Amino acid sequence: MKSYEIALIGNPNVGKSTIFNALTGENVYIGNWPGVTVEKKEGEFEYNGEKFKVVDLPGVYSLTANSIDEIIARDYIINEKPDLVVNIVDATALERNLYLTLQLMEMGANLLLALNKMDLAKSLGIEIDVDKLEKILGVKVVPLSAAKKMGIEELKKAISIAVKDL
Ligand SMILES: Nc1nc2c(ncn2[C@@H]2O[C@H](COP(=O)(O)OP(=O)(O)O)[C@@H](O)[C@H]2O)c(=O)[nH]1
Ligand SMILES: [Mg+2]
Ligand SMILES: [Mg+2]
C-alpha cells in the first residue's frame, strides 16, 4: 500500500488533539520525544486506498527555538520531511497564527491549512474569508468544526490531494 507521512501542528488550544483523534484509527501510539517527557502521539488512517501516517507535533506559536516544543517541532519538520504538514488554525484566532504559517513556508514545508472552530466563530459573529486566505497564501484551506464531527472527511480528502503536487 502506498504510504505517506503527515504531521499536525498549530497553536495551543486549536482542537489539534480532537482532530488527531478523529483523523486516526483506534491504534494510536503514545510515546515521548527522545530525551524528554514531551508526549509524542502517532496514528494512521487509510483513505481512498492509501495509508497516511499521522504524527502529532507540540502546539506552538512559532518555530524560532523559544522553548523545547518549538525545538522538537522544527527539528522534526526539517529532518523527517513529512510529505505534508497540516497547520491547524483557530478560526476565532486567525491573526495570531500568521507567523507559524509564514515560518512553515519559509522552512519549505509542503502545507495545508485546517480552519477549525468555524462553529464557534459562527456563534461569535466572526466572519472569515477563506477564498481570500487561500489566494494570499497559495495553500488550500479546509473549514471545519472537529468537535461537531464536521468536515473531517473534507480534511482527509484535502490531505490526499495535497500530498501529490501541482
Ligand atoms: N466550538 C468548537 N470547539 C472545539 C472544536 N474542536 C475542539 N474544540 C474545543 O477546543 C478545546 C481544546 O481542544 P484540544 O483538542 O485539546 O485542542 P489542542 O489544545 O490543540 O489539543 C476542547 O475543549 C474542545 O472541546 C470545534 O470544532 N468547535
Ligand atoms: Mg478517529
Ligand atoms: Mg483515533
Q: How many C-beta atoms lie closer than 10 Å to residue 103's C-beta?
A: 17
Nearest CA residue ID for atom 25, ligand 1 = 147
Q: List the shell of residues around ion ligand 3, using CB closer than 5 Å.
A: 21, 24
Contact (CB, 8 A) for 9 and 85: yes
> Element (H or E) spanning 147, and its range?
none
DSSP lists the bridge partners of residue 7 as 55, 85
Q: What is the DSSP letter of 26?
A: S
Q: What domains are defined for the chain?
A: 1-166 (3.40.50.300)
Dihedral of CA 110/114/115/120: which sign?
Answer: negative
> Element (H or E) spanning 33, and its range?
none
Q: Which atom belonging to ligand 1 lies closest to the Cα atom of 19? A: 15
Q: What is the largest CA-CA distance in the chain?
A: 44
Task: Give the ligand whose atoms come closest to the C-alpha of residue 147.
Answer: 1
Resolution in angstroms comes to 2.1
93 annotated to bind ligand = no
Identity of the amino acid at 42:
E
Contact (CB, 8 A) for 51 and 1: yes
